Structures are given as C-alpha cells and as structure tokens.
Ligand binder design. Structure first.
Ligand SMILES: CC1=CC(=O)CC(C)(C)[C@@]1(O)/C=C/C(C)=C\C(=O)O
Ligand SMILES: CC1=CC(=O)CC(C)(C)[C@@]1(O)/C=C/C(C)=C\C(=O)O
Lengths: 165, 166
C-alpha cells in the first residue's frame, strides 16, 4: 500500500531482519486505536500476556514489564514507549530487555480508516536482531507468528465491541 | 490455486485447525521432489531437524523418529509415511507421537511444474492438527504455519542452490 512505504519499510543491519503485517478489521478506528494505544494494558488484546505493570501514568519514555504465559521461550519482557501520536494514530515500541531471544526489537504500528461496503486497517512492522544460530527467515517467520496472533486477536476484540456499540 | 481444492482443502473437527502454504521455487521439479520424498532424510532441508532414524528401507507405513534442535517446545517426534506417489508427486505424513504439543497432525504435500522467468516448481503443503487445551485455532495454526514456512523456504534455498551447479 501507500502507507507501507511511509512508516513501515525498514532498513536493518546485516544481523537483522524486518517484516510488516497487515490486518483489516470490521470495526471503527476509535475502538481499534483506543485498544492499541493503551500502553499499560496490552493483555486486553495480546493473547500471550498474562500481566503488565507500569509505574505511574504512561507517557513517552515509560517502561512496561510484561509477563507472558507458559509454553513460550520467555517469561518476561521489558518494553519502552517510543512514540504515541493520538492524532496520526501511530504507536512505537522498543523491547529493551527480558527473558527472551529478541534483542534490539523495535516496532511501529499504524491504524487507518477504511471501507465498510466503517473499517480499520492495522499495519505493524518490526526490526529485530537474528539470534546467533538462527537465520533471518527463521527469526522473522517466528516473530510474524506472534504478531499475527496479536492482530487477529485485536480484530476479534474490536469487532466484538463494535457489535455491542 | 485450483490444486488446493483437489488435495489441500481439509474438513476439521471442532477442536482442530487447518491451513495450506504455497512456495514457488526457481528450480526444476526433479530436484525439489528428490529432496521432499526422502522420508529418512528431512534434515537435508528442514532446518530444525538434528537427526532422523528409520529402521529398514522406507516403505509406506514406515516410522521415522526425528530429533529436533534445542530452543523449541519439543525434543522428539515420531512420524509415519502415509502416502508417497512418485508419479503424481504427492507425500502424506502423520505425526503419531513425541514430547511436543501437536496431537493428530496430518500433512499433505504436492509438487507441480511451473514456468519460472524463462524451469520452476510450485510446492503446496497443508495440514490438520488438534488445538491444544488452552490455545485457540488461530494460535495453533499461526505457529504451525511458522514451521512450514521455515521448511519450504529452506527447501527453496537448497533446491535453487543445487540447480546452480547443474
Ligand atoms: C509473546 C512473545 C514471545 C517471545 O518469545 C518474546 C516476547 C516475550 C517479547 C513476546 O511477548 C513477543 C511479542 C512480540 C514479538 C510482539 C508484541 O507482543 O507486540
Ligand atoms: C520443528 C517442530 C516443532 C514442534 O514444536 C513439533 C515438531 C517437533 C513436530 C516439529 O518438527 C514440527 C514440524 C512440522 C509442524 C512440520 C514438518 O516439519 O513437516
């Protein structure tokens, strides 16, 4: 699309991979945005987050500590809010630490209005270091699986709330 | 495609999910098929297999025990050759055991000739698998799909590399 080139086509280092995922949601922008924007409450649509803690009211620079469910190669992740534009509908996160295999993970999510035939298009893209011993493809296929899980869930939650009002 | 309706559109139990993946490879069919069909040698293109054991010459009904690399929610898998048609280029596998979370995994893979830019081959692999208690259909299928993309991409890489050399 037009938007992929604007925010989502990333230049990454040799030891890195990058990808972008698109999701269409039969819900209005305001529902979808007010779910993704909530930095201290990803567990509301992210299926693998069991717990999330943020000290103070969230602002740019804030850290969150997220605990993930059993069955994953990770138990905790520490994440920083890099960008949050309520007017342009842009969210930037960088994972800065924790239990897991994702070093230098950086993320940008954008939300856009679309066609009922009101809908919403969510694009999330990332960059991440390839762990020693894995390939670019392996790393990016796995991370994409996580993101698909998130955006599909975000879709379901959003469309559920839309049907109620 | 029109092929996915023939071999790859599966009906599911409620507790199951199903999906199909396509890969185009810039290599001739003979190379791709030779790799895919070697039931006792999946580690030749499957990047997560560290070891494979098949007792006796592989026939229909044969079992393989695959050992898997560290870093996965699995160490071993035991798998059965359900179907191998060397003329139609069809392979069917069923995962019957191991210490992993894929109960009742069934797999079908077909290979088809294509015209590459100037030659090429299209690989379709689809599966059915139980949703583990506590996961959703989406989670289950998105994860298994990650594994299959890894395998088919590697298959593409190995195939095209071999095609370079003649
Ligand atoms: C579910 C999970 C699995 C891991 O192995 C790493 C980590 C714990 C960071 C993670 O929460 C990853 C989450 C990702 C990639 C995106 C997100 O949630 O926006
Ligand atoms: C790589 C891996 C990870 C697991 O969690 C289960 C298992 C060990 C079965 C597996 O080998 C799965 C392989 C799959 C789904 C298809 C294949 O390779 O044809």
């Amino acid at each position: 699309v037009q938007y992929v080139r604007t925010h989502h086509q990333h230049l990454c280092r040799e030891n890195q991979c990058t990808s972008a995922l698109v999701k269409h949601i039969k819900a209005p922008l305001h529902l979808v945005w007010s779910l993704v924007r909530r930095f201290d409450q990803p567990q509301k649509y992210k299926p693998f987050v069991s717990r999330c803690t943020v000290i103070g009211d969230p602002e740019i620079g804030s850290l969150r500590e997220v605990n993930v469910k059993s069955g994953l190669p990770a138990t905790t992740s520490t994440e920083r809010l890099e960008l949050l534009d309520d007017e342009e509908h842009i969210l930037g996160i960088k994972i800065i630490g924790g239990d897991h295999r994702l070093k230098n993970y950086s993320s940008i999510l954008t939300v856009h209005p679309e066609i009922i035939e009101a809908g919403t298009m969510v694009i999330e893209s990332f960059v991440v270091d390839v762990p020693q011993g894995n390939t670019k493809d392996e790393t990016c296929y796995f991370v994409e699986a996580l993101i698909r899980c998130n955006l599909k869930s975000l879709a379901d939650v959003s469309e559920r709330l839309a049907s109620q009002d």
